Design an enzyme around this catalytic site. Structure first.
Site, PDB file in Angstrom:
ATOM      1  N   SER C 159       0.859  -1.191   0.000  1.00 13.00           N
ATOM      2  CA  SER C 159       0.000   0.000   0.000  1.00 13.00           C
ATOM      3  C   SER C 159       0.905   1.255   0.000  1.00 13.00           C
ATOM      4  CB  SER C 159      -0.977  -0.236   1.083  1.00 13.00           C
ATOM      5  OG  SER C 159      -1.974   0.747   1.029  1.00 13.00           O
ATOM      6  N   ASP C 251      -9.795  -4.369  -4.301  1.00 19.36           N
ATOM      7  CA  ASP C 251      -9.100  -3.238  -3.698  1.00 19.36           C
ATOM      8  C   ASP C 251      -9.579  -1.942  -4.336  1.00 19.36           C
ATOM      9  OD1 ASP C 251      -7.321  -1.414  -2.601  1.00 19.36           O
ATOM     10  OD2 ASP C 251      -5.560  -2.719  -2.874  1.00 19.36           O
ATOM     11  N   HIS C 281      -7.448  -5.550  -0.293  1.00 19.16           N
ATOM     12  CA  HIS C 281      -6.320  -4.828   0.273  1.00 19.16           C
ATOM     13  C   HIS C 281      -5.941  -5.395   1.667  1.00 19.16           C
ATOM     14  CE1 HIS C 281      -4.175  -1.474   0.268  1.00 19.16           C
ATOM     15  NE2 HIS C 281      -4.342  -1.370   1.550  1.00 19.16           N
TER      16      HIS C 281
END
Ligand SMILES: CCCCCC(=O)Oc1ccc([N+](=O)[O-])cc1
Ligand SMILES: CCCCCC(=O)Oc1ccc([N+](=O)[O-])cc1
Ligand SMILES: CCCCCC(=O)Oc1ccc([N+](=O)[O-])cc1
Ligand SMILES: CCCCCC(=O)Oc1ccc([N+](=O)[O-])cc1
Ligand SMILES: O=[N+]([O-])c1ccc(O)cc1
Ligand SMILES: O=[N+]([O-])c1ccc(O)cc1
Ligand SMILES: O=[N+]([O-])c1ccc(O)cc1
Ligand SMILES: CCCCCC(=O)O
Ligand SMILES: CCCCCC(=O)O
Ligand SMILES: CCCCCC(=O)O
Ligand SMILES: CCCCCC(=O)O
Ligand SMILES: CCCCCC(=O)O
Ligand code: NA
Lengths: 309, 309, 309, 309
Positions: C159, C251, C281
């Site tokens: 991320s 995601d 995610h």
């Protein structure tokens, strides 16, 4: 001076005015009849029930008489209350505690089986315990003759019968019956030896149960002071079933009940401790003479319903 | 090899996997935030209620924030629950125990007032006690801001908050508020000093509350070992109100709760002792992560209704 | 609806039932703690390793804390993995991604150096990037304090850490460190601005990372939309090192990772693109709560070994 | 200008110095023979294998010749590689790509089945595709004559054979064979129309494959510009199987392979994109003249093993 409820005090004052003989001054037969007469006048009347039925079961010394109380002729499986009367293991029978049994059956909507166990001095310790244990195991087996299925048993009893309650729970804990003890209800029980306790000296005279009577019962019953079947405070508490201990604040053996409830907490067991304020020993059976004691019984009933879930 | 419920065990295994810093290794703000996060993820969500309202009352140091929970917009006079959150007197707030308060309000159908008392180390002992006492007295006075009339109060709280429960009941016993304490509910309380107890050694690590956290809290709060406001086992139990003591079998401070219930029995007071089997400290606030703890809370609720008669 | 694995769906249902506040509605430290608890409770436990060592290196603002992970106590020169944690450049630290780091170290049998870079809002853009770049250059210099000679570096992160991975590779491509970037592994990275993307709209709520959280992070970090250190899709891709881009099909920033891998192909660069199906995610850090995500991580590991030769 | 490896450049110089004629200038038979001569001179020798066996299967226009390659006479069930040679759908046979097929079989330790599909202009589009599809379905059926069981198929082919690879994977995706396509390997494929592409103009002359030859092949094959069986970039990519796309940086149809890999990423499909630096179209079959192209093939092999697990 210790707190005494007004209706309780009036009952005690009337007993004092009669100035009757001690248990030692009477014959065995006179003592047993005097107790029959006490409860016959002092307790509330029997509840009407669909079932009040004499039964019997095999015991170690012959058949044990039983009495079945049920508000219902036919019911679903559930716990069955197994009741052992007070009287020091010397007096009492199925009739002295009959009205109380009908009340417990009516208010719980469960069956109650009372045990006519062998009495001292004719049958000393451990006769009463052997019979109470045998009868409870028999009920726990859901025998055809019982007429309802027991999913568990609830030992309950007053004074000597509260002693028997704990001892039965210990015996069934060590050697299970067909179903478990789901709850026990020792009511002003003798668990620890009362000799040397503060309550015994404080309430030795004038509070229904006297020190003199305690000594008379002890001499007749001849319980071994080192035997947990005589003094179940000495037993293994680590797996005690859920318990309601009810005592009375003016009881010479009050501290024995305190001792037992403390021993259960010390062992991590679930217990409700109720100490009824301003009433004596035997409050479960003087509910007409002392009307406020019906409320005390009803508190025990409410605790039993809560602890059964 | 003490007994642990499977869902309890899984939660403990996840905490062990996380392997976080100790409370003492964090900043105070971090330590407090970690407790918010723990209960946030572990507890069941809030119940919906007609009334959830922030209030305050005067205290010795300034205003005390409060939160009122009620399933009813309008209700007649009756007992009011006065709740004190756990957290060692160092952590916790109105939000860490919010969902539990909504559950108590929903299941009891009584109003609940939670107290946002001052915390250590910024406000050492007896700050938390001062605030809990003041707020309880205020609720007991039926102020107009409350919108309910109190006929009695019911102090309740977990761990510190269970300590506060007992202390508040003793302080109001000695110097009554406008209405009495009709029931107290200390949940896994600190009553006697846990140092030296068998439970503290047995459950010092790996059971959610650790010996390290207990020491962290003690160092911050600075309660005097001889002060009954710090260790209420030292107080006078002879007029204690009706009590429900709830403990957990895996709690390092379990034996402190055992001690308190034993002292109440010793003093002749009515008490329900429930020791939840196979769960830890904090079981009241982990009811989503460990679903079986909802049933443990419901047992306390049932005992409360029974003791309120 | 979109495909969701059954174990993934159960985790999402648990999050939905908790019905917690948004990151913006918490205090900043409560937001950080909620992320510690999320990874702490959902991820597999740490691997046991020969070496887990805290250290630091110089950075432009002061010292940068680092954590070295190695399955081997001593090892010859080889590539060194340089890891940058996720958390929006606002939350996360060495502990939130510790267990994942031990897993990468164990499964790759290479040393891993994780970077405790400065966080927003206290340190806005480009603080995180400065620290990640400085630490990676320091590792690439084979300092004696590290005790592992580097023949190359492998930037990796999830991320925001995947954003950092790409930026670091671009910065070192333009001004080389002592050894080259031999492979980069951006895991569900933010490469292009996600605003306007189809995935952001499709997975705005209920898929772990939410549009609200993305906005919270963006407000704190303050990256310039025209600065390739903020949005490295804007950078020069013509000499990008060998790359593995891993995304998740559910995601909201999936399309940002798709964009980056497409730009690498457009520029003629070697790239493995893996889009994990039916997971969200943060799949790298929920490997206990959603067991199937362990296999997703293992696929990344297999691609890394292949691309390293 | 563009990067060219030294060994590649010298081969291009030798081709230029030999100054052969164009495909248009030759007779069909001569053109086909020059291709045999090119790979015969330029490729590494065939591997020795236990099994090199001619087979055939039914096709829509008669029997389709096949050649089976296997390092093992007897093997367990596993994937089977189904290979389609390059040559523009006009030139090439089972012998032009024979040595490459032995290399794939040796290095993968999997069976390879090469398809001798019908050639244009004798058999224009869609003949080649119809045969490649039929042969792949036949292999996927684990026919007795194959001598080993297929658990899946792996379509693979260079230039026109890379076109066929993608088309076959799309046709089997829409209408499954008896086992799935577990991996496809289009090698410098024609996926989108090269006309208009930057690569076609940059590398129109002197890079082994010429714009002149591309046009020659197009006029003979007569693929429909709007038909996904002619130009599979036009097909449905949303369920494409795992893919390895290999291109060459000096290839006039390089951008066609870039386009296909980008379309797979755009569709969320797993893909390895490898662009071999400094080499031309046909690098898989010039592994002796340009020795470094063996290493290029070996990278494809390594990616294949990773993508098969
Ligand atoms: C003369 C009437 C009082 C005795 C009847 C009674 O009060 O029931 C008891 C049962 C058992 C014991 N004991 O075991 O000591 C004491 C009392
Ligand atoms: C983060 C671990 C839970 C610690 C917080 C908690 O569990 O609430 C407590 C309150 C008071 C005491 N104490 O007084 O020891 C212990 C625990
Ligand atoms: C509580 C779930 C959100 C936690 C943060 C997280 O999921 O790791 C991220 C890092 C960076 C970005 N970003 O760049 O938007 C998004 C996510
Ligand atoms: C010396 C002849 C040129 C060698 C390259 C070659 O013959 O392999 C190809 C196959 C198919 C296509 N195409 O489909 O455009 C292009 C090239
Ligand atoms: O025993 N007694 O003297 C009694 C008998 C009956 C009664 O209603 C009250 C007292
Ligand atoms: O007061 N009463 O009604 C009584 C009194 C005495 C007794 O033995 C029974 C009942
Ligand atoms: O055909 N060949 O073997 C060759 C071609 C070119 C070269 O530079 C070397 C060898
Ligand atoms: C092991 C301790 C036994 C009970 C102590 C008490 O009666 O207070
Ligand atoms: C002392 C910790 C183990 C528990 C034994 C008990 O129930 O007292
Ligand atoms: C386990 C697969 C072998 C490749 C190991 C490597 O080259 O990094
Ligand atoms: C090589 C010359 C053959 C010409 C084939 C055609 O006209 O399509
Ligand atoms: C979920 C994806 C499985 C196959 C990957 C591909 O389409 O290339
Ligand atoms: Na830290």
């Amino acid at each position: 001076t210790p707190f005494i409820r007004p209706d309780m005090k009036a009952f005690l004052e009337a007993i004092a005015a009669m100035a009757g003989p001690t248990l030692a001054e009477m014959t065995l037969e006179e003592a047993r009849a005097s107790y029959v007469a006490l409860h016959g006048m002092a307790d509330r009347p029997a509840r009407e029930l669909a079932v009040i039925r004499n039964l019997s079961c095999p015991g170690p010394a012959g058949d044990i008489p039983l009495r079945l109380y049920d508000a219902r002729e036919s019911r679903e499986a559930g716990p069955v209350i197994t009741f052992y009367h007070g009287g020091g293991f010397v007096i009492g029978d199925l009739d002295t505690h009959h009205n109380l049994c009908t009340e417990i059956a009516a208010l719980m909507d469960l069956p109650v089986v009372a045990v006519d166990y062998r009495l001292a001095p004719e049958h000393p310790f451990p006769a009463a315990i052997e019979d109470c244990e045998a009868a409870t195991r028999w009920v726990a087996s859901s025998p055809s003759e019982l007429g309802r299925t027991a999913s568990g048993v609830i030992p309950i009893g007053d004074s000597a019968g509260g002693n028997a309650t704990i001892v039965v729970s210990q015996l069934l804990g060590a050697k299970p019956a067909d179903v478990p003890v789901v709850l026990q209800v020792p009511i002003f029980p003798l668990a620890s030896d009362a000799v040397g306790s503060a309550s015994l000296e404080a309430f030795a005279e004038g509070f229904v149960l006297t020190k003199a009577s305690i000594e008379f019962f002890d001499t007749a019953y001849k319980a071994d002071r080192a035997d947990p079947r005589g003094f179940p405070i000495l037993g293994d508490h680590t797996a005690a079933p859920p318990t309601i201990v009810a005592t009375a604040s003016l009881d010479p053996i009050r501290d024995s009940g305190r001792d037992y409830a403390k021993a259960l907490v010390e062992a991590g067991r679930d217990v409700v401790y109720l100490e009824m304020e301003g009433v004596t020993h035997s409050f479960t059976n003087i509910r007409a003479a002392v009307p406020s004691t019906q409320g005390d019984l009803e508190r025990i009933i409410a605790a039993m319903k809560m602890m059964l879930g």
